[PDB]
Structure 1
Amino acid sequence: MRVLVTGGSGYIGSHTCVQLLQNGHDVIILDNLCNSKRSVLPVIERLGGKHPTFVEGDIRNEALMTEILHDHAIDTVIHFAGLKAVGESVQKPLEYYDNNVNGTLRLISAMRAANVKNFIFSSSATVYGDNPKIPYVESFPTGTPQSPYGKSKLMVEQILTDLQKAQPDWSIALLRYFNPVGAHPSGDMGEDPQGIPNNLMPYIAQVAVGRRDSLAIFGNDYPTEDGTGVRDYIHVMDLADGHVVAMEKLANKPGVHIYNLGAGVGNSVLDVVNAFSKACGKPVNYHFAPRREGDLPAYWADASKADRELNWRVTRTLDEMAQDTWHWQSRHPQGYPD
């Protein structure tokens, strides 16, 4: 199929593009480069074994989106583009609602214009809000996210749902991601955050590579087995694969197809640290700090639906997530070149 991958040069998109090309699809990447570098492009093609077309531009540019869509005869759109720094979203809400809410709106408006009706959206478990019932299941009603980032994702799912209702021939997948980690097994592609990483895995990796002193473990008094926060970590390669399958199986299948994408099991902060210490061959330095504002104690996905419906399930393990991350971090300490 002909697919437009917005945010295609970012973390999850890059890996998804590789898997897409491996499957022989024709890939067009659209990215504004606010959080990625052109240097990843050659890696995508090399690892993907096929050339992906790249377009530098913004999802907020409806006219350009429409043109791309038509120019490349796109059949389906995978939308990863947007802003995702939780804390920053609290400090700069407008930028979040603009890039995520208006950004998606401009893109689907362009799709309508170009007669494109297959869409895949990067959603998040954050949409469940403060749900005491865990694991989270697609049948649960959504809750109220506590950050502008979380809210923006829920708002987009609602807009997409209403759109599908009004244009019933559309096929829209709402893919609720849990906690993406890991890197391509080659060690030549991975997450390349700029500045202080907000997520656990990259933070740990930077401590291990010798850039940072100690990992601050936010809270050790949660009601969990070890007192640290529990999450559902999912290898970016499994996530990528899920996207290819969802795209292939849902294209032209009318409806709003919601699926949680996670491993279906929880791991604590210590579990992650331990796996990384093991991967890197040295104990990762860490200390206990106060709870981070807005953090829930524990949650993970119920991924039965995706298994059942798409025959998709994770295959990489926690150790692999850690190992692949270290291999990338270690082979490319400065990330992608400028």
Structure 2
Amino acid sequence: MRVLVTGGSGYIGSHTCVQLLQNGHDVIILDNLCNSKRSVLPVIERLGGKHPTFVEGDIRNEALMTEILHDHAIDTVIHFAGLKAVGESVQKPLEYYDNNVNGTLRLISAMRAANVKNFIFSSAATVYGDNPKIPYVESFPTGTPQSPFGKSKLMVEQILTDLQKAQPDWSIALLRYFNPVGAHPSGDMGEDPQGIPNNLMPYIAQVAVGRRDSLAIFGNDYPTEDGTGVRDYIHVMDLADGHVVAMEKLANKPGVHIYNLGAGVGNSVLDVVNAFSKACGKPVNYHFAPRREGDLPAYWADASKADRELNWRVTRTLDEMAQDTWHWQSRHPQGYPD
């Protein structure tokens, strides 16, 4: 199929792009490069084994969106583009609402204009809010995210839902992601955060690589087995695969298809650390720090639905997630070149 991948050059997008090309689809990448580099492009094509078309631009530019859509005869759109730093969203709410809410709004409006009716949105587990009921299931009513980032994702899911209701021919998938980690097995592609990494994995990686001193373990008094926070870590390649399957099986299938994308099991901070220590061949330095504001104690996804309906489930393990990360971190200490 002909697919437009917004945010195609970022972490999740790049991996998804490779899988898509491998599946022989025609890929058009639209990215504004605020959080990625042109350097990834050649890697995508190499790994993907096919040439993806790249367009530098902003999802906020409806006129350009509309033009791309038409110009390439897009069939479906995968929307990864936006801002995701939680803490920063609290400090700069407007930018989040603008990039995420208005950003998606301008894109779907362009779609309407070009007669494109298949969409895939990068959502998040955050939309469940403070849910005591774990694992999280798609049948659960949504809650209230505590950050402008989380709120922005829920607001878009709502806007998409309403849009589908009004234009019932649309196929819209709301993919709720859990905690994406890992990198391409090649070790030539991976997450390349600028500055201080906000997520656990990259931070660990940066400690291991010798860039950082010690990993600060946000709270050790949680009501978990080991006292550290528990999450659902999902390999970026598994995530990418799920994106290809969702796209292929859902295209032209009217409705709003919500699916949690996770491993369906929880791992603590200690578990992750240990896995990385193992991967990198040296104990990862760490210390216990106070709980991070807004952090829930433990949650993971109930991924039965995606298994059942799309025959999708993860295949990579936690160890692989850590190994692949170390391999990329180690092979490209400076990430993507400028």
Give the TM-score range, shorter chain.
Answer: over 0.9
- 2:55 aligned counterpart, secondary structure: strand
Task: Give 1:253 shift.
Answer: 0.1
Distance 1:327 1:39 in 2: 19
Q: Return 5+ residue gaps in structure 1 as ranges.
A: none
- Runs of 4+ aligned structure 1 residues displaced above 6 Å come to none
- 1:176 aligned counterpart, secondary structure: strand
CA deviation string 1:259-290 (max 9, x = no partner): 00000000000000000000000000000000
- 2:119 aligned counterpart, secondary structure: strand
- 2:302 aligned counterpart, secondary structure: coil
Distance 2:332 2:191 in 1: 11
Task: Give 1:138 shift.
Answer: 0.1
Task: Give 1:210 shift.
Answer: 0.1
Task: Give 1:37 shift.
Answer: 0.0
Query: Structure 1-normalised TM-score?
Result: 1.00
- 1:104 aligned counterpart, secondary structure: helix
- 2:264 aligned counterpart, secondary structure: coil
Distance 1:111 1:294 in 2: 35
CA deviation string 1:195-223 (max 9, x = no partner): 00000000000000000000000000000
- 1:44 aligned counterpart, secondary structure: helix
Corresponding residue for residue 247 of structure 1: 247
Distance 1:31 1:49 in 2: 20
1:203 and 2:203 matched: yes
Task: Give 1:120 shift.
Answer: 0.0
Task: Give 1:111 shift.
Answer: 0.0
Distance 1:169 1:198 in 2: 39
CA deviation string 1:175-206 (max 9, x = no partner): 00000000000000000000000000000000
Task: Give 1:54 shift.
Answer: 0.1
Corresponding residue for residue 264 of structure 2: 264
Task: Give 1:320 shift.
Answer: 0.0
Task: Give 1:321 shift.
Answer: 0.0
Distance 2:79 2:295 in 1: 26
Query: Structure 2-normalised TM-score?
Result: 1.00
Task: Give 1:256 shift.
Answer: 0.1
Q: Give identity over the alignment, percent.
A: 99
Distance 1:119 1:23 in 2: 18
- 1:272 aligned counterpart, secondary structure: helix
CA deviation string 1:36-89 (max 9, x = no partner): 000000000000000000000000000000000000000000000000000000
Distance 1:199 1:125 in 2: 15
- 1:322 aligned counterpart, secondary structure: helix
- 1:81 aligned counterpart, secondary structure: coil
Distance 1:141 1:32 in 2: 34
Task: Give 1:14 shift.
Answer: 0.1
Corresponding residue for residue 68 of structure 1: 68
Corresponding residue for residue 136 of structure 1: 136
Paired residue total: 338
Q: Return 5+ residue gaps in structure 2 as ranges.
A: none
- 1:204 aligned counterpart, secondary structure: helix
Task: Give 1:225 shift.
Answer: 0.1
- 1:121 aligned counterpart, secondary structure: strand
Distance 2:335 2:187 in 1: 11
Distance 1:47 1:134 in 2: 37
Task: Give 1:303 shift.
Answer: 0.1
Distance 1:197 1:108 in 2: 31
Distance 1:2 1:165 in 2: 25
Task: Give 1:173 shift.
Answer: 0.0
Task: Give 1:258 shift.
Answer: 0.1
Task: Give 1:25 shift.
Answer: 0.1
Distance 2:49 2:305 in 1: 32
Corresponding residue for residue 311 of structure 1: 311
Task: Give 1:21 shift.
Answer: 0.0
CA deviation string 1:234-273 (max 9, x = no partner): 0000000000000000000000000000000000000000
Distance 2:58 2:225 in 1: 44
CA deviation string 1:7-50 (max 9, x = no partner): 00000000000000000000000000000000000000000000
Distance 2:295 2:107 in 1: 31
Distance 1:126 1:199 in 2: 14
Corresponding residue for residue 58 of structure 2: 58
CA deviation string 1:282-338 (max 9, x = no partner): 000000000000000000000000000000000000000000000000000000000
- 2:276 aligned counterpart, secondary structure: helix
